[PDB]
Design a protein around this ligand. Sequence first.
Ligand code: C6N
Ligand code: C6N
Ligand code: CA
Ligand code: CA
Ligand code: CL
Ligand code: CL
Ligand code: CL
Ligand code: CL
Ligand code: CL
Ligand code: CL
Ligand code: K
Ligand code: K
Lengths: 211, 366, 366, 212
Amino acid sequence: QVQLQQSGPELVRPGASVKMSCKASGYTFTNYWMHWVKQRPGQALEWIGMIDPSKSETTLNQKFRGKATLNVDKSSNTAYMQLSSLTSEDSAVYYCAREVYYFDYWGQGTTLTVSSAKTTPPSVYPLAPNSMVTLGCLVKGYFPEPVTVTWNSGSLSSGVHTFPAVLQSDLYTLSSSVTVPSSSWPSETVTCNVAHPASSTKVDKKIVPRD
Amino acid sequence: TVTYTNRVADARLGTFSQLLLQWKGSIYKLLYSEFLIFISLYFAISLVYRLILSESQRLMFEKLALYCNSYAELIPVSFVLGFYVSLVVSRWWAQYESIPWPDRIMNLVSCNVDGEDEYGRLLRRTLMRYSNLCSVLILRSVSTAVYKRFPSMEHVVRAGLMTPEEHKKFESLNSPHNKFWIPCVWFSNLAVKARNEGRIRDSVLLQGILNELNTLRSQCGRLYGYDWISIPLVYTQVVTVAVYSFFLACLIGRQFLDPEKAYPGHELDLFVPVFTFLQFFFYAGWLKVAEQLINPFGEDDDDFETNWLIDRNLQVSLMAVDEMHQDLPILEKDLYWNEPDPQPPYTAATAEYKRPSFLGSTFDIS
Amino acid sequence: TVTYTNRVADARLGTFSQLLLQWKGSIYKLLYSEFLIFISLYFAISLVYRLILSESQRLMFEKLALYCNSYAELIPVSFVLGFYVSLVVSRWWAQYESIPWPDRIMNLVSCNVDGEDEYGRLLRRTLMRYSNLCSVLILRSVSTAVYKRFPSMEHVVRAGLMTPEEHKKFESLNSPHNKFWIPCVWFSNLAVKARNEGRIRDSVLLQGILNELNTLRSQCGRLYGYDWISIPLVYTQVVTVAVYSFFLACLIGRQFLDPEKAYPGHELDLFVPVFTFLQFFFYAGWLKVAEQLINPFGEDDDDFETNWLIDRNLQVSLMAVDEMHQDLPILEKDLYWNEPDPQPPYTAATAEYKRPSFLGSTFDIS
Amino acid sequence: DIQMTQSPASLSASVGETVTITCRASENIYSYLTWYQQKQGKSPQLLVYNAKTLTEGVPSRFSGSGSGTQFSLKINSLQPEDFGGYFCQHHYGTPPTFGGGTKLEVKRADAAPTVSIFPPSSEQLTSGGASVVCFLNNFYPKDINVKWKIDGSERQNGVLNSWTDQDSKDSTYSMSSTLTLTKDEYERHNSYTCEATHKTSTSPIVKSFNRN
Ligand SMILES: OC[C@H]1O[C@H](O[C@H]2[C@H](O)[C@@H](O)[C@H](OCC(CCCCC3CCCCC3)(CCCCC3CCCCC3)CO[C@@H]3O[C@H](CO)[C@@H](O[C@H]4O[C@H](CO)[C@@H](O)[C@H](O)[C@H]4O)[C@H](O)[C@H]3O)O[C@@H]2CO)[C@H](O)[C@@H](O)[C@@H]1O
Ligand SMILES: OC[C@H]1O[C@H](O[C@H]2[C@H](O)[C@@H](O)[C@H](OCC(CCCCC3CCCCC3)(CCCCC3CCCCC3)CO[C@@H]3O[C@H](CO)[C@@H](O[C@H]4O[C@H](CO)[C@@H](O)[C@H](O)[C@H]4O)[C@H](O)[C@H]3O)O[C@@H]2CO)[C@H](O)[C@@H](O)[C@@H]1O
Ligand SMILES: [Ca+2]
Ligand SMILES: [Ca+2]
Ligand SMILES: [Cl-]
Ligand SMILES: [Cl-]
Ligand SMILES: [Cl-]
Ligand SMILES: [Cl-]
Ligand SMILES: [Cl-]
Ligand SMILES: [Cl-]
Ligand SMILES: [K+]
Ligand SMILES: [K+]
């Protein structure tokens, strides 16, 4: 079965360089041209370039002329792409695809993140105030992604909305809301649990009603 | 591929001069990089002589240049080029005429494979495709332009030149060699099966169809041969050695020596060796002729348009054996039905071309 | 045999230059020994002049060198080489196209010799083998590469190209001449017997098969002819005499004479005659072209791969008339069944090659 | 370059319905167009190639058409699986540009946003910063507009929003606006209101609080 296995996600500082891979299997490597696509949220898929495994002939997109570099290793059946002079805009999802008049097989994807920030723990702030009362947690100033948010160690799952993190001055910030019947609060204790594996941080903040 | 046939239709004032202004597949485009390297090396040496070398070193350089210049001999180089390029040009045209065309099989299959029913249609269409497949398979083996369009046998299938069942049968046949000959066997078998089903009247008509197939097979074989059997490497190396030997001599020999020293042959300093550069275009360009045509199935401007040929053949083939099977226009009496000696008209511009019949040189023109 | 066809597909910067770095079937490999002998003889003479000869002897040597150098004439040598090498190259390609291929007989025998039973199978296989035997027999007569693989008729049998019964019949036929023609007679007789047994429908189909056989016989005859009729010995000797005459002159004439004596043309002493050595590679290498191709069935790097051909032909032949007899894939409607003007796809890299139809030079491109 | 213009930017329909996405070429690309399906987080998948031909796994309910500069994908008799991302790509030359994309979302009944405004936590205020959060949960359609007003005056600087994906259960959307200030500027004002505009009503659903 045809399968394209790319490298894991990467995290680098601006100005540096990165080199991701893509190992093909289940078909003759040299008989299909390998392409590379860039995926940014909100924007359309960008074609970076292609490579002929056989003779290592590259054909890049004018827009990526000085940013991307392509090459392969016929022996290991893997293709490579190198991105230089990395900036914040070079952050995206990068795919490798096989061509047969179309892209019939893509890789899982390689997520590249570019920012100049050291690992930072999340600051968990409680959010407290008619039949069903809404509560919440505010996770600000952390890095890097991701973070796991649960209510009462997972027991309280239904009726929760964990919003996608946003970027504020080279640091991520997200919110998480939960709605429970007004009768069960503050009667039943409610506490959100924030897990930040990047810093091995595990904080629990019980939302006590306003004083 | 780079057709200028119409420009050179008549021998007028600038018939050939005009072509010096063309870039596509030109001498300029092919010599560009080489010329620049030559230019650079020349003027580099030139400055070293004019600005760096000492009076004593300059005298050695001048003696070295006289030595080198005496070995810049065009006659021997012109010989080997002429003969070599002729060989290349010869194979070049032979390879073109070896590109198979469906038209001859096309004519027979269209008229001699009976049936105006779906099967008769499927029969004729499948026969032609076996021919075109026999061609496409060999073309992608010899042409880089075609191979990059059909890098894998899957591309062939997905492009509609081969069915997945045919591909299955293809794989089932175990052979370590190029299978381009497979469809050619299928064709002959299918043609025979068609005759047994009564779709092909006589054996005379069947053998006639089998013959045109074999011809196409011979075409494919020639293409394989020219691709396999390159012009002997030693021969190719000889002509480049000869050519480069000449330009090596020119690099130093054609340097503008001190006018004051009054060397016989070097009385004038023009800084730029106009005629030496013109000789470079001549000889390096002459070598580029061979360089480009030594493999006419590549991706050069003047290399054959094999992919268009494939497309054209596909369209025309099927159309002639399907939509055109036993399908004729309404027979009419021709405009010259009662005219034994017709006199077709001439436009105003072409009346001068209405000539009296040439009977023979021996006859008196009266 | 030494195929560099793909390297020279396009006319880029180093298309031909790159080939100067190749050893297999190269000018270096073929000239190696000769060049060394030339090098030695030159510098040997050079030292004798510089270190041994007396002032008076040196003056004689210098006069001798001026004499020899005046007889180093490239133009006459270049003439005879060009014409001679052209003859050699001509025969070289003619001999290749004279190597018989089974494919044409293969197609006919596979489809026109009826029977899906063991006998029908044995019949078709035996017919093809008679063809391949006709070839192998002539090849081992003209190719040293093949003969060393089949030194005796026993080798032919044990290799499975001939049965012991066939070998018995072979010996039974008393003839002092080369029997390569025997299998070709067997074939025609067996083809006729096959027709009488009803395995070959008409005589039209039989004559068609007999014709393709005769063609193969003509192929074998050409190979025999080129092997028998060598290029006239006198012609070959003439070009070597001319070439050697040149290098004889150079050995003494191209010696670096005393710079002090100020001989016109000999103002600089470089000790190593760069351009004379480059002329050696040119002309000796040019002669080596003929030297290698004068017998393309030998064991040179660029001599034909006849043994592979034999193997390939054996495999393909039998496979096409056995496993492929009346064996076709499943007929399907083609992907362009309802499409009169198909537009086959192009890969990303080859879209530039999708061109508009060339209608003719006379038509306005609008 | 060849420009791929896809429309609609997003389509909303319910199971059983039949939708039609459209791609238009900047210039003739013959029948060289492909249709891809991409579900959030996952890598795209080939649906149709050569403008009409369906690939292996694709079910008969999918069909492509067009040629030249006008193409279209048509999904008749929708299913739950058929919901997600859809984009096109031309395959005539280099670079093979992609289409803008199309978000195929489920259609339901309109719903009003349950607005909930929250004041800065005391733990945060002692840290030296103030952040006013405002939630807008379970509404429909996805379109919505949030405005902040510090003491009546409009506030746009310092606000950061974040929306969610259509809920796989109730098929409704949600978003969260966060106004961030300095502890100094936060204590310089009284009322912090969070006004929300939707198609569910003509008058903005406002929710506020005072700093005491
Ligand atoms: O069947 C009849 C043929 O004749 C006509 O073609 C003519 C052209 O009309 C001629 O103009 C052309 O030759 C022209 C040039 C002649 C000068 C050279 C004379 C030298 C001879 C040796 C001794 C020294 C003098 C041949 C070129 C000479 C240049 C060399 C190279 C440098 C070194 C020396 C001179 C002049 O250049 C022309 O100039 C034009 C612009 O430069 C080019 O394009 C133009 O085509 C357009 C047509 O509408 C024009 O309107 C527009 O001006 C422009 O786009 C032409 O293609 C180009 O050929 O070449 C053709 C002559 O066969 C006619 O159009 C056709 O029907 C048909 O091809
Ligand atoms: O269809 C496009 C074609 O183009 C490409 O091939 C190129 C090669 O990539 C070129 O590199 C090559 O030419 C290279 C050399 C150019 C310098 C000569 C310029 C002179 C011209 C006259 C005036 C003076 C300057 C031509 C040789 C010039 C030498 C002569 C001889 C001495 C006297 C003068 C110069 C350089 O040598 C290269 O060097 C390489 C190592 O030396 C060789 O092998 C390498 O291949 C590997 C590929 O992965 C490399 O990674 C690795 O480094 C090495 O193993 C190359 O084969 C060899 O060609 O030759 C080809 C040009 O057609 C491409 O790979 C293919 O797709 C295709 O063949
Ligand atoms: Ca070429
Ligand atoms: Ca030989
Ligand atoms: Cl000369
Ligand atoms: Cl043949
Ligand atoms: Cl000059
Ligand atoms: Cl001479
Ligand atoms: Cl004969
Ligand atoms: Cl010399
Ligand atoms: K002229
Ligand atoms: K070159």
